[PDB]
């Protein structure tokens, strides 16, 4: 079945918070943006039109593998060139390899924080568990200023610390103090999605246990908890069974991970209360006080319903250290090893599709682009060493990876230093590792993920904290470029080329005109020595 949408971006005032009428990004004049629900193997065709006066746009469908259709991933200068004001890009893709809970968001500057985001649900007939009803909750933080404005003082010489701007409130389904009307003795499938741009959240329901049955599109064995820690971009789908009494109402609770906040403003409501309503007439629940925020479920120990044994020894190991540092222009950037992601003059995919037999040479994709080439079916391992004292949720396009190590917090307040993964010295990896698309490193810690390069494409690996992505915390994976070239489904459509010309962005071979293919590029500001 084909679902066709016609959506146009725009700006309108809303008071999402309850406390500031403020421009938000609308879809055809409406807010919030719609949610898509399709069946396994359906076709989705979205005509996105940039109706904004002065920004570019894009749309990325988070978690979808885009197998055979990399062009549709929606990452400017990886997958497409940006959508210019007035232009219309057609996103045309099938959904043959994904099931469960996903979302879509703009992949331009900070755009999605300003409202351009929505849920994408794929149903399957073979979901193992029973439930009576189903819904979602979209957790997020909310700012009173647009990202464009915050960026001016975020990426600034008057911000040498790289301190990320502090949000004004937590929101659910684009309000505060939300009502969820329930029926007694009923099992609800509750999709909890963190569609925020920055802050991790703790989530729990007063006097109700939660049975985790899916993370990031991957069905899991039932795991019961009282509390979840959800980073931005991740999804926990959870079974909740309601009580027999219609006598009392219960608090739905979301809490900031204030650890991630540079400073805590004294008036910021760190924890927000919503309402699970059994009785429409009874007392609205007060805040549910919790004794500890240290006993949330560690998703590392989750067990996929479809077991896959840990992949064998890696053919390709990528080791990256994560740090924040100041450059020559005095502003604070984010680094994978010694590289801040700096967008190229020609989108990654566009150069692979016109480099012919030189697509295997890493040099042509640029030096300041952090591009790696992955071989036909090789097992790839990413080793990430956090040298920064914060938590980061890293996300990988095109794959759900195996999480084989994710070390403990190394708290610098207790005097502890950063620790890297040591291939010679580490706990035994799990036999059947957890799988997902978005995973956090703990402060000053490390993680190791593994996946098979079985999905020809161009895939972004980055921190999903919008501020850190703006700081350039990302790298590019090119999965067998020859596999990309050989597949017909992968060739760029007339519409996409039309977007590029309308944007005055080339489809050549990184800078140079398909002529020597050895560059004279676009670099990062030089180092501080």
Ligand X SMILES: *C1O[C@H](CO)[C@@H](O[C@@H]2O[C@H](CO)[C@@H](O[C@@H]3O[C@H](CO[C@H]4O[C@H](CO)[C@@H](O)[C@H](O[C@H]5O[C@H](CO)[C@@H](O)[C@H](O)[C@@H]5O)[C@@H]4O)[C@@H](O)[C@H](O[C@H]4O[C@H](CO)[C@@H](O)[C@H](O)[C@@H]4O)[C@@H]3O)[C@H](O)[C@H]2NC(C)=O)[C@H](O)[C@H]1NC(C)=O
Ligand Y SMILES: *[C@@H]1O[C@H](CO)[C@@H](O[C@@H]2O[C@H](CO)[C@@H](O[C@@H]3O[C@H](CO)[C@@H](O)[C@H](O)[C@@H]3O)[C@H](O)[C@H]2NC(C)=O)[C@H](O)[C@H]1NC(C)=O
Ligand Z SMILES: *[C@@H]1O[C@H](CO)[C@@H](O[C@@H]2O[C@H](CO)[C@@H](O[C@@H]3O[C@H](CO[C@H]4O[C@H](CO)[C@@H](O)[C@H](O)[C@@H]4O)[C@@H](O)[C@H](O[C@H]4O[C@H](CO)[C@@H](O)[C@H](O)[C@@H]4O)[C@@H]3O)[C@H](O)[C@H]2NC(C)=O)[C@H](O)[C@H]1NC(C)=O
Ligand U SMILES: *[C@@H]1O[C@H](CO)[C@@H](O[C@@H]2O[C@H](CO)[C@@H](O)[C@H](O)[C@H]2NC(C)=O)[C@H](O)[C@H]1NC(C)=O
| Residue 107 labeled ligand binder | yes
Q: Does 489 bind ligand NAG (CB under 6 A)?
A: no
- Residues lying near ligand U in the complex (CB under 6 A) are found at 221, 223, 297-298, 301-303
Task: Indicate the residue among 300 and 482 with the shorter CB distance to ligand U.
Answer: 300
Using CB under 6 A as the binding rule, the residues of this chain from 374 to 413 that contact ligand Y are none
Chosen residue from 69, 71, 111, 169 binding ligand X by CB under 6 A? 169
119 binds, among ligand Z, Cu ion, ligand X, none (CB under 5 to 8 A by kind): ligand Z
Which uninterrupted H or E stretch holds 452? Answer: strand 446-452
Q: Does 392 bind Cu ion (CB under 5 A)?
A: yes
| Residues 232, 199 contacting (CB under 8 angstroms) | yes
Q: Does 397 bind Cu ion (CB under 5 A)?
A: yes
Which uninterrupted H or E stretch holds 334? Answer: strand 332-336
- Min separation Cβ 147 and ligand NAG, Å: 26
Cα–Cα distance between 143 and 166 in angstroms, integer? 8
Q: Does 158 bind ligand Y (CB under 6 A)?
A: no
| Residue 528 labeled ligand binder | no
Using CB under 6 A as the binding rule, the residues of this chain from 332 to 391 that contact ligand NAG are 338-339, 360-361, 367-368, 375
| Residues 516, 361 contacting (CB under 8 angstroms) | no
Task: Indicate the residue among 286 and 491 with the shorter CB distance to ligand X.
Answer: 286
Q: Does 497 bind ligand Y (CB under 6 A)?
A: no
Cα–Cα distance between 463 and 460 in angstroms, integer? 10
Task: Indicate the residue among 56 and 231 with the shorter CB distance to ligand U.
Answer: 231
DSSP string, 233-291: T-EEEEEEE--S-SS--EEEEEEE-GGGSSS--TT---EEEEEEES-TTSPPP-----S
Q: Does 311 bind ligand NAG (CB under 6 A)?
A: no
| Residue 462 labeled ligand binder | yes
* Dihedral (CA of 172, 397, 326, 419) sign: positive
| Residue 496 labeled ligand binder | no
425-441 in b/e burial notation, b at 16+ Cβ within 10 A?
eeeeebeebbbbbbbbb
Cα–Cα distance between 393 and 403 in angstroms, integer? 13
297 binds, among ligand Z, ligand X, ligand U, none (CB under 5 to 8 A by kind): ligand U
Cα–Cα nearest to 400, from 305, 289, 498, 276: 305
| Residue 463 labeled ligand binder | yes
Which uninterrupted H or E stretch holds 70? Answer: none
Task: Indicate the residue among 138 and 201 with the shorter CB distance to ligand Z.
Answer: 138
- Min separation Cβ 384 and ligand U, Å: 22
169 binds, among ligand X, ligand NAG, Cu ion, none (CB under 5 to 8 A by kind): ligand X
Q: Does 254 bind ligand X (CB under 6 A)?
A: no
Instruction: Tell which residues of the chain come right before a gap with C–N over 2.5 A.
Output: none
Chosen residue from 392, 399, 435, 464 binding ligand NAG by CB under 6 A? 399
Using CA atoms, how far residue 300 sits from 204, 227, 430, in Å, is 19, 15, 10
DSSP state of 358: G
Chosen residue from 156, 269, 362, 493 binding ligand X by CB under 6 A? 269
Q: Does 251 bind Cu ion (CB under 5 A)?
A: no
- Min separation Cβ 256 and ligand Z, Å: 20
Can you say which residues are annotated as belonging to the binding site for Cu cation?
A: 60, 62, 105, 107, 392, 395, 397, 462-464, 468
> Under the rule (CB under 6 A), what is the footprint of ligand Y?
45, 92, 255, 270-271, 287, 289-293
């Amino acid at each position: 079945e084909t679902h066709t949408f016609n959506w146009t971006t725009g700006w309108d005032y809303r008071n999402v918070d309850g406390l500031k009428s403020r421009p938000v990004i609308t879809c055809n004049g409406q807010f919030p943006w719609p949610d898509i629900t399709v069946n396994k193997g359906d076709r989705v065709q979205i005509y996105l039109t940039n109706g904004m006066n002065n920004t570019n746009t894009s749309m990325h469908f988070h978690g979808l593998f885009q197998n055979g259709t990399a062009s549709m991933d929606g990452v400017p200068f990886l997958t497409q060139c940006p959508i210019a004001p007035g232009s219309t890009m057609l996103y045309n893709f099938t959904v043959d390899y994904n099931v469960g809970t996903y979302w879509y968001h703009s992949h331009t500057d900070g755009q999605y924080e300003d409202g351009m985001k929505g849920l994408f649900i794929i149903k399957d007939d073979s979901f193992p568990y029973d439930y009576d009803e189903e819904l979602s909750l979209s957790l997020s933080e909310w700012y009173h200023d647009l990202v464009t404005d915050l960026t001016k003082s975020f990426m600034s010489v008057y911000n040498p610390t790289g301190a990320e701007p502090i949000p004004q409130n937590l929101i659910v389904n684009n309000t505060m103090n939300l009502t969820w009307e329930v029926q007694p003795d009923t099992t609800y499938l509750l999709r909890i999605v963190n569609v925020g741009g920055f802050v991790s959240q703790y989530f729990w329901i007063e006097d109700h246990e939660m049975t985790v049955v899916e993370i990031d599109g991957i069905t899991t064995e039932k795991n019961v908890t009282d509390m979840l820690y959800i980073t931005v971009a991740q999804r926990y789908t959870v079974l909740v069974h309601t009580k027999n009494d219609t006598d009392k109402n219960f608090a739905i609770m979301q809490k900031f991970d204030d650890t991630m906040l540079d400073v805590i403003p004294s008036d910021l409501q760190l924890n927000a209360t919503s309402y699970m309503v059994y009785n429409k007439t009874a007392a609205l629940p007060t805040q549910n006080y919790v004794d500890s925020i240290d006993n949330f479920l560690d998703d590392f120990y989750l067990q996929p319903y479809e077991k896959e044994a840990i992949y064998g020894e890696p053919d390709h190991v990528i080791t990256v250290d994560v740090v924040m540092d100041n450059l020559k222009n005095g502003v604070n950037y984010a680094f994978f090893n010694n590289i801040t992601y700096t967008a190229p003059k020609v989108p990654t995919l566009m150069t692979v599709l016109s480099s012919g037999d030189q697509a295997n040479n890493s040099e042509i994709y640029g030096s300041n682009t952090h591009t790696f080439i992955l071989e036909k079916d090789e097992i790839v391992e990413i080793v990430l060493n956090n040298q920064d004292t914060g938590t980061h949720p890293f996300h990988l396009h095109g794959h759900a990876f195996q999480t084989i190590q994710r070390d403990r917090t190394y708290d610098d307040a207790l005097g502890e230093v950063p620790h890297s993964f040591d291939p010679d010295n580490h706990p035994a990896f799990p036999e059947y590792p957890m799988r997902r698309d978005t995973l956090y490193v703990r402060p000053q810690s490390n993680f190791v993920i593994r996946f098979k390069a079985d999905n020809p494409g161009v895939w972004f690996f980055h921190c999903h904290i919008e501020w850190h992505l703006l700081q350039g915390l990302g790298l590019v994976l090119v999965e067998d470029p020859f596999g990309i070239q050989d597949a017909h489904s992968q060739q760029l459509s007339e519409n996409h080329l039309e977007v590029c010309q309308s944007c005055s962005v080339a489809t050549e071979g990184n800078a140079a005109a398909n002529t020597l293919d050895l560059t004279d590029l676009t670099g990062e500001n030089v180092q501080h020595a």
